[PDB]
Amino acid sequence: AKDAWEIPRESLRLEVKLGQGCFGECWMGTWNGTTRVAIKTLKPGTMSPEAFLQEAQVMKKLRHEKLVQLYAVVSEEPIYIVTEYMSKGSLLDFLKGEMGKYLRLPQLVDMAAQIASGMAYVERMNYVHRDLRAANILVGENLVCKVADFGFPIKWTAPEAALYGRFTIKSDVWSFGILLTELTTKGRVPYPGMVNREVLDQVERGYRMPCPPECPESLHDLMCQCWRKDPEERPTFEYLQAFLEDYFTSTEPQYQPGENL
Numbered sequence: 001a002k003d004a005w006e007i008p009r010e011s012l013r014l015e016v017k018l019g020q021g022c023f024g025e026c027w028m029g030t031w032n033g034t035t036r037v038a039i040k041t042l043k044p045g046t047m048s049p050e051a052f053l054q055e056a057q058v059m060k061k062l063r064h065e066k067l068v069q070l071y072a073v074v075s076e077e078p079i080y081i082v083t084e085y086m087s088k089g090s091l092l093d094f095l096k097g098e099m100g101k102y103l104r105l106p107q108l109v110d111m112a113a114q115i116a117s118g119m120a121y122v123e124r125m126n127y128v129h130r131d132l133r134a135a136n137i138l139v140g141e142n143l144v145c146k147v148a149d150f151g152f153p154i155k156w157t158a159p160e161a162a163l164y165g166r167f168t169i170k171s172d173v174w175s176f177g178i179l180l181t182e183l184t185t186k187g188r189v190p191y192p193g194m195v196n197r198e199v200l201d202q203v204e205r206g207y208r209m210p211c212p213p214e215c216p217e218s219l220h221d222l223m224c225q226c227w228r229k230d231p232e233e234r235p236t237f238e239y240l241q242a243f244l245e246d247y248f249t250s251t252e253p254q255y256q257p258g259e260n261l
């Protein structure tokens with residue numbers, strides 16, 4: 001037999017070309033002719049179904065409101081995989097976007113709360129991401145973020161995981177902590193002035209990103225404890241889901257608005 005995730009090929013319609021790469025093709029499209037959908041294609045001369053449909057299981061296992069819902073699949077090559085179309089694209093581009101201009105701190109932390117969300121659910125289902133960054137975090141109507149790419153970016157990576165490959169969810173927090181600078185300085189490269197070797201050399205030797213211009217020292221504290229040396233005394237994604245979600249009641253009920261944030 002086959003699983004429920006499967007459907008026919010005539011119902012699908014690809015209607016906009018969203019990307020191009022060494023990986024497959026990002027397309028918008030229509031399923032059943034009256035449902036907006038995001039599609040990614042894979043090649044049958046640069047990969048195999050089993051080899052890349054291992055990323056599908058892990059997707060098909062996980063189903064949460066802040067991870068990009070894998071609606072459906074086409075298993076026999078060619079292999080269209082199908083997904084909720086988040087409209088506003090990646091978060092990095094939405095923040096260097098026109099919008100990211102007027103975007104203020106209440107939405108920069110709320111989105112960041114929405115993702116602390118998603119990374120809690122992974123965290124409870126005992127998975128790691130390996131890669132977490134603004135360049136990965138999706139977004140849709142009314143700023144609805146989601147994380148994605150589940151199953152080199154050394155600027156977002158915990159030292160244990162750059163050097164040894166201790167990719168454990170206290171690497172994905174460090175990243176989240178780097179993610180946390182991006183929202184709060186609009187997609188401006190983590191670690192300004194600096195390049196992948198200078199990073200480590202310094203990172204280790206103690207150095208951590210100073211609080212951004214105009215950014216509350218509490219969030220810098222949240223940042224600076226996602227970047228603690230010993231992985232496991234970083235905070236959990238649930239602790240973080242909470243701290244961010246109740247931030248303006250419980251933490252900063254002292255902030256009036258500013259010149260960027």
Ligand SMILES: *[C@H](c1c(-c2ccc(Oc3ccccc3)cc2)c2c(N)ncnc2n1CCOC)[C@@H](C#N)C(=O)NC(C)C
Pocket residue numbers: 018019020023025026027038039040055068083084085086087088089090148149150151
């Ligand atoms: C293309 C893209 C996607 C998108 C769709 C499916 C995947 O598949 C996948 C497989 C395994 C694990 C995680 C994810 C990835 C990305 C997408 C969606 N879903 N909705 C809207 N836009 C989307 N884009 C890009 C922005 O389009 C507005 C991306 C990929 N891969 C991509 O091209 N982004 C970067 C340039 C890499």
